Design a protein around this ligand. Structure first.
Ligand code: NI
Length: 341
């Protein structure tokens, strides 16, 4: 049974609610982005209207085989009427095709559902500038002040400089980057651009990237692994055993691996600056954990909410424990007392 924080009151709508069977009263199912916890339950047998971005609809059609007649892609930054209700989709600064959804209810209430997002000051100049929001359904993944990490631009600078130094010292070093979902494509694309290489990957991963409307993508990726010195592998294979095994398969073309695991936050964030990050090494294999996040830090989240000044906040992450819920509610009240709304 569908939880309350996935339902939009005063509408026939749900958000990211495909694993509950036929939800009573739902006339339109919105999907914020193509991450498995959010699409869980969709397949070629689904026969209700799904509303989403163009990119998310390419993934639904090609990867999950949802039939075309049930996919309703909407343009971003554009007022659209869905089943009698005005909606807008906004870029969420999460993975490719991820959106926030603004709902203009028939009684005058305005609701923002962030989906998953990484808050940014650029959002203060979107269509959100123009009107009041009564209710905020908030991605609270890192809602505690211990969650700090650098900007995505600092992290990519570290990765490019690390990879270029290693491969210039040793032209026979291979770079490997871990992946298990869409998102974080700048990691491997920026490294391959500084090295003058295409990124090599499995046919299944190439297929996924071909759905993402990334400009000039045919110039940047390939299934011919032998032609490439940046390889993508499943995240589970980014360990010394898995990497040793991969190096065997390369036919003595390479004699060293430098590997990246883009995680979100790890508690090595509570002590170490990006500048000071060092790898784990065994023999001719080195593995870097880099803190590339596609969710808001605590400070980014607090700035966005203090700017928006919602009347009510509904968390959508960390809702299963009483300790999490009480922690989040305390911070919401601090923020409101500090800013004066
Ligand atoms: Ni996500």
């Amino acid at each position: 049974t569908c939880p309350f924080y996935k339902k939009i009151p005063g509408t026939g709508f749900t958000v990211d609610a495909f694993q509950y069977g036929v939800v009573e009263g739902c006339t339109a199912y919105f999907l914020t982005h193509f991450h498995s916890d959010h699409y869980a339950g969709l397949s070629k047998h689904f026969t209700f209207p799904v509303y989403c971005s163009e990119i998310t609809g390419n993934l639904l059609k090609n990867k999950l085989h949802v039939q075309e007649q049930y996919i309703h892609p909407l343009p971003l930054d554009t007022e659209c009427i869905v089943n009698g209700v005005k909606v807008v989709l906004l870029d969420a600064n999460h993975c490719p095709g991820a959106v926030m959804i603004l709902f203009y209810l028939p009684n005058g209430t305005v609701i923002l559902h962030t989906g998953d997002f990484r808050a940014d000051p650029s959002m203060e100049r979107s269509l959100l500038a123009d009107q009041k929001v009564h209710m905020l359904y908030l991605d609270t993944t890192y809602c505690s002040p211990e969650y700090t990490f650098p900007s995505q631009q600092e992290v990519i600078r570290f990765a490019i400089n690390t990879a270029f130094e290693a491969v210039t010292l040793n032209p026979h070093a291979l770079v490997v980057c871990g992946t298990y979902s869409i998102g974080k494509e700048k990691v491997f694309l920026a490294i391959a651009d500084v090295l003058g290489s295409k990124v090599g990957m499995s046919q299944e991963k190439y297929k996924t990237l071909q759905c993402l409307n990334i400009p000039e993508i045919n110039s940047l990726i390939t299934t011919d692994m032998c032609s490439s010195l940046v390889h993508l592998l499943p995240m589970m294979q980014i360990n010394f055993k898995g990497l040793q095994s991969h190096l065997k398969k390369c036919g003595g073309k390479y004699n060293q691996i430098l590997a990246f695991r883009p995680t979100g936050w790890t508690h090595s964030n509570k002590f170490t600056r990006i500048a000071d990050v060092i790898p784990q090494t065994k023999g001719n294999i080195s593995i870097y954990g880099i803190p590339y996040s596609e969710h808001s830090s605590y400070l980014e989240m607090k700035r966005f909410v203090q700017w928006l000044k919602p009347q009510k906040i509904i968390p959508t992450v960390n809702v299963g424990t009483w300790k999490s819920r009480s922690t989040m509610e305390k911070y919401f009240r601090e923020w409101k007392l500090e800013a004066g709304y």
